[PDB]
Amino acid sequence: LRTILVTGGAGYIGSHTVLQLLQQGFRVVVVDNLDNASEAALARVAELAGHDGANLVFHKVDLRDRHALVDIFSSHRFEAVIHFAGLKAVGESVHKPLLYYDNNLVGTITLLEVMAANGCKKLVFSSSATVYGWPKEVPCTEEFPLCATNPYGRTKLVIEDICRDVHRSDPDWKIILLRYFNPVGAHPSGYIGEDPCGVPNNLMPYVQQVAVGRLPHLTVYGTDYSTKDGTGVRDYIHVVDLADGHIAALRKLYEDSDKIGCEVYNLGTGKGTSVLEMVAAFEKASGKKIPLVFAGRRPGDAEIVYAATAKAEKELKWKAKYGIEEMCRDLWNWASKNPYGYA
Amino acid sequence: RTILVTGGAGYIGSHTVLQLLQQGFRVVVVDNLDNASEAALARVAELAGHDGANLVFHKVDLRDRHALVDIFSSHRFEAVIHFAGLKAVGESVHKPLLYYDNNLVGTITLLEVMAANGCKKLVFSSSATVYGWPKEVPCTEEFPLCATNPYGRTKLVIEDICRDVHRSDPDWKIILLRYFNPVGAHPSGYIGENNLMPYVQQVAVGRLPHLTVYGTDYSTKDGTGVRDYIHVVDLADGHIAALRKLYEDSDKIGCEVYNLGTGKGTSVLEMVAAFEKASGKKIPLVFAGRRPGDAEIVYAATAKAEKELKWKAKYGIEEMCRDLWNWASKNPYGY
């Protein structure tokens, strides 16, 4: 038996990773306070897991709840921990920074302490390409200068530094930091997917709601950038590909862990795609038309960001297999099948 | 006028509490006593003279939200001076989570309790360590910031937290004070304290045989490291000025950062010579290579602090060594 602890597994990226984990034969324990997710996402993952659905156990616990967390760790043998949990809305983080510093930092510090006290010192952390700030060049390698422009991005960069300091003090720690780029899409079944609250802030969940008629038009944030068509360019990666990156991270920690301490890997496709190109791909995949409103640049937006995949391909032995066309297909499938989410 | 002082039983905190007690403030100190004795605040109450009755102490950890909420509901604080936290750099590298927990989680809880109680006026004890190895000197508040150890990272992260908090809530008035190198003690010799001058003192009395000079080939005038050493009583006065600035000229304050230094740079050998004159003892030396992570030369740009904060250091190197020797001679085994 191989058991994995997954914080925030009820959420968007976590649920898709939990499903892949169950299909690989892992036992999965999820810890999630359901603050930005519902039980339904986990129940449907259990259903998609077929026979392996019973290998998923859900604990409705906050990572800051130290006693509830010790109970879980002292009553389990965890091979590793995948740490998805945290708040992630950039706008909300600027307006309520203490909420973000509290939930993300105190939750992570508590988790790391409970892990070290219960002999589990293998960790995979959800970092983000936001730590590259506004990069001076592309593609972004893992050695690019790091910075943060908002409280949310600050919590990611600080947790990274905490993980590096922790390994520096204790060589028994094996930590892989995964800098996600822009995940889009859903499981190709259309049964699970991203279910954002309120008005979505990311591009593709917004275009999604325009396509099903819930919102009237997409607002394009700035057209005067130095890109092909003036819109921002991003590295869009299929969420299923992001999930498989975590499987490859566990395989790295399980088979070739003597040569790692606290490592960082990009999880991207290496291809840059503009806003209009994504809208064009979603119109082709869905047959719907996305009305456009043109506005100025969004404060804090980068111009062009995509990943240098060489390091992940070499050390993790991992490369994304889904392209833009499949991402929009699977997003539309989840969208048309579940236009109002899990509710 | 009541002021909450976290970490007020410590080195810099006790001296600030004494200066506050002499200025006529009621002072409530919160300190878990994990790195300080209660005898320090007992002696401070003595030196406060007729004002000793204004000091109130609570042995409370900042992470204890329930206890911390009760103290804030018991008084109406004008502002909070935040000294509390761990500061041993070597203890930050070997035990980083202990530092990230105590400093960050303690500070987060305090800022939240402050906001809920309505006391959004903060003076935070930062450090010139955030200037890393400066490319030029003197170091202004605009210099690029970076941390080189877990302790320094907690200092820089707390500064950014205060930056973000004020940005989200204009009712907040925050002053960040970057200390430099504290030296000395209250001139009475009654209170005081990993650093050069405490190491020099142990060599003077004989607890240690010699002082290792870490690096002799620096691009300085005598080849040894240069720092901005500031009297701890001057540091205490800098916080009185920070409260004066918050209480008077406050409408143009958001999250202001002020250096607290003398503006003068003194080498290692110059401090050894200064302490030998004030103590009469001799300091045998052993010259060694550069210590890893050590800045070459660092000292403060004091122009911003002299104008807007209306503060300037009063004490020089000679008096620092005199008060340090005075306190350590009369109390060789501490409190």
Ligand SMILES: NC(=O)c1ccc[n+]([C@@H]2O[C@H](COP(=O)([O-])OP(=O)(O)OC[C@H]3O[C@@H](n4cnc5c(N)ncnc54)[C@H](O)[C@@H]3O)[C@@H](O)[C@H]2O)c1
């Ligand atoms: N979503 C993205 O586009 C993206 C890209 C880069 C990085 N990331 C990071 O990847 C991770 C996963 O993102 P996501 O899209 O799945 O987000 P999500 O909000 O869908 O999932 C995060 C989950 O964590 C849970 N959670 C939050 N605080 C918790 C706490 N204190 N204790 C327990 N559970 C808690 C939430 O309830 C939620 O279910 C996050 O850490 C995010 O910051 C996100």
Ligand SMILES: CC(=O)N[C@H]1[C@@H](OP(=O)(O)OP(=O)(O)OC[C@H]2O[C@@H](n3ccc(=O)[nH]c3=O)[C@H](O)[C@@H]2O)O[C@H](CO)[C@@H](O)[C@@H]1O
């Ligand atoms: C500043 C900011 O919020 N950055 C976050 C976001 O931005 P990031 O810009 O990377 O991603 P978004 O999905 O928010 O935006 C993608 C692109 O589409 C454009 N766009 C987006 C939404 C919309 O309604 N209209 C529109 O035109 C943007 O200008 C951008 O060029 O990416 C990640 C989310 O997964 C986070 O790690 C980043 O912190």
Ligand SMILES: CC(=O)N[C@H]1[C@@H](OP(=O)(O)OP(=O)(O)OC[C@H]2O[C@@H](n3ccc(=O)[nH]c3=O)[C@H](O)[C@@H]2O)O[C@H](CO)[C@@H](O)[C@@H]1O
């Ligand atoms: C690694 C470390 O501890 N950093 C702390 C230290 O740095 P900082 O170097 O500024 O102060 P130190 O007391 O450690 O020594 C200052 C100077 O004396 C020299 N020296 C010191 C001791 C010795 O035994 N021999 C010798 O030659 C140093 O090289 C340096 O040039 O003082 C500050 C006190 O406020 C703290 O903020 C810093 O976090």
